[PDB]
Design an enzyme around this catalytic site. Sequence first.
Site, mmCIF file in Angstrom:
data_model
loop_
_atom_site.group_PDB
_atom_site.id
_atom_site.type_symbol
_atom_site.label_atom_id
_atom_site.label_comp_id
_atom_site.label_asym_id
_atom_site.label_seq_id
_atom_site.Cartn_x
_atom_site.Cartn_y
_atom_site.Cartn_z
ATOM 1 N N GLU A 81 0.811 -1.216 0.000
ATOM 2 C CA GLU A 81 0.000 0.000 0.000
ATOM 3 C C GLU A 81 0.853 1.279 0.000
ATOM 4 O O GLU A 81 0.453 2.312 -0.578
ATOM 5 C CB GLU A 81 -0.972 -0.003 1.184
ATOM 6 C CG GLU A 81 -0.357 -0.228 2.561
ATOM 7 C CD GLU A 81 -0.122 -1.700 2.884
ATOM 8 O OE1 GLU A 81 -0.245 -2.085 4.068
ATOM 9 O OE2 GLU A 81 0.170 -2.476 1.948
ATOM 10 N N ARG A 85 0.645 4.246 -2.803
ATOM 11 C CA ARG A 85 0.531 5.698 -2.623
ATOM 12 C C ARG A 85 1.609 6.429 -3.415
ATOM 13 O O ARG A 85 1.336 7.457 -4.042
ATOM 14 C CB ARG A 85 0.617 6.117 -1.154
ATOM 15 C CG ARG A 85 0.495 7.630 -0.983
ATOM 16 C CD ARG A 85 0.936 8.110 0.387
ATOM 17 N NE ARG A 85 2.385 8.023 0.566
ATOM 18 C CZ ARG A 85 3.231 9.035 0.387
ATOM 19 N NH1 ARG A 85 2.781 10.227 0.022
ATOM 20 N NH2 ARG A 85 4.533 8.855 0.576
ATOM 21 N N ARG A 86 2.833 5.910 -3.387
ATOM 22 C CA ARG A 86 3.909 6.558 -4.144
ATOM 23 C C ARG A 86 3.602 6.614 -5.660
ATOM 24 O O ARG A 86 3.800 7.655 -6.333
ATOM 25 C CB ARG A 86 5.233 5.839 -3.875
ATOM 26 C CG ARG A 86 5.713 5.981 -2.434
ATOM 27 C CD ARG A 86 7.071 5.328 -2.215
ATOM 28 N NE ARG A 86 8.184 6.219 -2.541
ATOM 29 C CZ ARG A 86 8.675 7.147 -1.723
ATOM 30 N NH1 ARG A 86 8.160 7.321 -0.515
ATOM 31 N NH2 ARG A 86 9.692 7.906 -2.118
ATOM 32 N N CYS A 136 -0.390 -3.768 8.105
ATOM 33 C CA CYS A 136 0.335 -4.181 9.309
ATOM 34 C C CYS A 136 0.279 -3.133 10.411
ATOM 35 O O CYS A 136 0.228 -1.929 10.156
ATOM 36 C CB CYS A 136 1.799 -4.496 8.989
ATOM 37 S SG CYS A 136 2.784 -3.086 8.400
ATOM 38 N N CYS A 201 2.086 0.254 8.543
ATOM 39 C CA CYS A 201 1.242 0.794 7.486
ATOM 40 C C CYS A 201 -0.064 1.349 8.032
ATOM 41 O O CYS A 201 -0.578 2.319 7.493
ATOM 42 C CB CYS A 201 0.961 -0.265 6.424
ATOM 43 S SG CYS A 201 2.446 -0.857 5.616
ATOM 44 N N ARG A 207 -1.822 8.586 9.233
ATOM 45 C CA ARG A 207 -1.088 9.791 8.885
ATOM 46 C C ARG A 207 -1.649 10.377 7.595
ATOM 47 O O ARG A 207 -1.891 11.571 7.521
ATOM 48 C CB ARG A 207 0.400 9.485 8.743
ATOM 49 C CG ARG A 207 1.249 10.597 8.163
ATOM 50 C CD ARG A 207 2.407 9.991 7.376
ATOM 51 N NE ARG A 207 3.422 10.964 6.985
ATOM 52 C CZ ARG A 207 4.436 11.334 7.757
ATOM 53 N NH1 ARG A 207 4.570 10.811 8.967
ATOM 54 N NH2 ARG A 207 5.318 12.226 7.321
ATOM 55 N N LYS A 357 1.282 17.802 10.333
ATOM 56 C CA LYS A 357 2.038 16.635 10.786
ATOM 57 C C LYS A 357 2.401 16.740 12.273
ATOM 58 O O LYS A 357 2.344 15.748 13.016
ATOM 59 C CB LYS A 357 3.301 16.459 9.936
ATOM 60 C CG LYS A 357 4.117 15.229 10.287
ATOM 61 C CD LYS A 357 5.200 14.946 9.253
ATOM 62 C CE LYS A 357 6.336 15.949 9.331
ATOM 63 N NZ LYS A 357 7.482 15.560 8.456
HETATM 64 O O1 LIG Z 1 5.905 6.505 1.425
HETATM 65 P P1 LIG Z 1 6.816 6.363 2.632
HETATM 66 O O2 LIG Z 1 7.794 5.215 2.529
HETATM 67 O O3 LIG Z 1 6.103 6.441 3.968
HETATM 68 O O4 LIG Z 1 7.746 7.682 2.627
HETATM 69 C C1 LIG Z 1 7.626 8.692 3.632
HETATM 70 C C2 LIG Z 1 7.760 10.079 3.024
HETATM 71 O O5 LIG Z 1 9.059 10.284 2.469
HETATM 72 P P2 LIG Z 1 9.265 10.546 0.888
HETATM 73 O O6 LIG Z 1 7.939 11.113 0.429
HETATM 74 O O7 LIG Z 1 10.424 11.515 0.849
HETATM 75 O O8 LIG Z 1 9.582 9.174 0.323
HETATM 76 C C3 LIG Z 1 7.564 11.119 4.108
HETATM 77 O O9 LIG Z 1 7.645 12.408 3.508
HETATM 78 P P3 LIG Z 1 6.367 13.385 3.485
HETATM 79 O O10 LIG Z 1 5.969 13.408 2.020
HETATM 80 O O11 LIG Z 1 5.365 12.718 4.401
HETATM 81 O O12 LIG Z 1 6.921 14.683 4.014
HETATM 82 C C4 LIG Z 1 8.630 10.999 5.186
HETATM 83 O O13 LIG Z 1 8.279 11.961 6.188
HETATM 84 P P4 LIG Z 1 9.263 13.123 6.727
HETATM 85 O O14 LIG Z 1 8.816 14.335 5.944
HETATM 86 O O15 LIG Z 1 8.934 13.194 8.201
HETATM 87 O O16 LIG Z 1 10.674 12.652 6.443
HETATM 88 C C5 LIG Z 1 8.681 9.577 5.758
HETATM 89 O O17 LIG Z 1 9.880 9.386 6.509
HETATM 90 P P5 LIG Z 1 9.944 9.470 8.114
HETATM 91 O O18 LIG Z 1 10.378 8.076 8.500
HETATM 92 O O19 LIG Z 1 10.980 10.547 8.365
HETATM 93 O O20 LIG Z 1 8.544 9.839 8.553
HETATM 94 C C6 LIG Z 1 8.705 8.493 4.683
HETATM 95 O O21 LIG Z 1 8.515 7.204 5.265
HETATM 96 P P6 LIG Z 1 9.708 6.125 5.393
HETATM 97 O O22 LIG Z 1 10.807 6.832 6.152
HETATM 98 O O23 LIG Z 1 9.080 4.992 6.172
HETATM 99 O O24 LIG Z 1 10.052 5.799 3.961
HETATM 100 ZN ZN LIG Z 2 2.603 -3.095 6.079
#
Ligand SMILES: O=P(O)(O)O[C@H]1[C@H](OP(=O)(O)O)[C@@H](OP(=O)(O)O)[C@H](OP(=O)(O)O)[C@@H](OP(=O)(O)O)[C@H]1OP(=O)(O)O
Ligand SMILES: [Zn+2]
EC number: 3.5.4.37
Length: 385
Positions: A81, A85-86, A136, A201, A207, A357
Amino acid sequence: QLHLPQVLADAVSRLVLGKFGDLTDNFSSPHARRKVLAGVVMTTGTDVKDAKVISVSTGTKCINGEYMSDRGLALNDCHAEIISRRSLLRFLYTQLELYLNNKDDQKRSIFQKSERGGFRLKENVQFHLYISTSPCGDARIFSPHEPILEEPADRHPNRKARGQLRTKIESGQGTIPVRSNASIQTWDGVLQGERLLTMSCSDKIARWNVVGIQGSLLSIFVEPIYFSSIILGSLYHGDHLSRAMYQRISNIEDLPPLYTLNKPLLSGISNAEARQPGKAPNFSVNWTVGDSAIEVINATTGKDELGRASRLCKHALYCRWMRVHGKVPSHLLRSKITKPNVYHESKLAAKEYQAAKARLFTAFIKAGLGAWVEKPTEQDQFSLT
RNA sequence: GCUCGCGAUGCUGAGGGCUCUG
RNA sequence: CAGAGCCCCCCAGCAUCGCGAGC
Ligand SMILES: O=P(O)(O)O[C@H]1[C@H](OP(=O)(O)O)[C@@H](OP(=O)(O)O)[C@H](OP(=O)(O)O)[C@@H](OP(=O)(O)O)[C@H]1OP(=O)(O)O
Ligand SMILES: [Zn+2]
């Protein structure tokens, strides 16, 4: 050809599974092997013909501590999931690019100008997240089996464990709570053998249900986007899922304008998927609409089988974003960015998003559910080349 | 209706083997 | 190279039951 909850649910499940079929030689491909399938479905009206599969993904693993990229070329989290989103982000970028090529394309873009500044979604455009199983963490950790028809009751609703923020842990199973003495993760620390934590997740979708799905960078351009529905193909537990998705942080307060606590439609499907046979694939398939074929990323390294960066990695997305900023006049910017260079800084430019956030993190802390676990700062300390 | 401690039995991402299959 | 079955072991949480203490 209807917009009832269950009809919708079965529809997006059918559509996503089908599209995944089309993308994998009708499930014959070696890349059709999957444990968890996810996807996003867009609707632009109450009719099912007005429904479009936007993205499709598989995967059940996260990057190892070893392979973190200070350049943002790796995928930190390849649970289906998240990847979905990405991919949705990529589609959004495609739609902004659509709006900004010629005035003729605008009528076919999902965006339009916004009387508050920047862009916003055309009326009656909705996104729907499908997962073949429960996400999860809080939504599944209790009762990882199908629900029974007589006692759907939690039977222990008021336990401390309920609603708690939990993390995927490197080299360990189960999603575990956050440490009371949780020394926040360090870059050099994790690279030196320490165990990498990634937010579960359930927590991530909550979030998304507060700060939107578009993330920080797109909030510079567009108004917050939320999921209208969350469909589970199996292991649907109404009370648990509803708690995990929004209910556990109803106590949240002082959100910035246009930011709400989104409570999407929750629904399982009529015919639940059985557990996919065999070992859990080492990789993570992704796909966005308008792509030739799927992309296969090694979930352990965050790159493909040849070490090439994914189209969904921080860097690539940043490139797309930069190319959209180039074509957007400063008077159409929701936030002031003027001269962007570093990733972290450009993220911090979205001040409203960041405040939202913050409100989220505080919301979780006050409920006694734990403090969110951020990646080391060094992660987002990079630029393009 | 919970929390803590000790056990018992299970459930859920690593590491190491054995056998078979194209 | 790819996939399947079985076995051993680790991970730190969750469930069920049983004792002890406490709100
Ligand atoms: O799709 P995810 O794997 O959850 O990626 C997110 C996403 O990072 P990116 O978009 O740069 O990949 C968040 O960025 P936002 O778009 O929500 O701002 C980031 O949040 P921060 O801005 O707080 O860095 C967060 O990382 P964090 O662990 O620091 O919350 C990170 O999730 P992952 O770190 O699990 O990849
Ligand atoms: Zn998961």
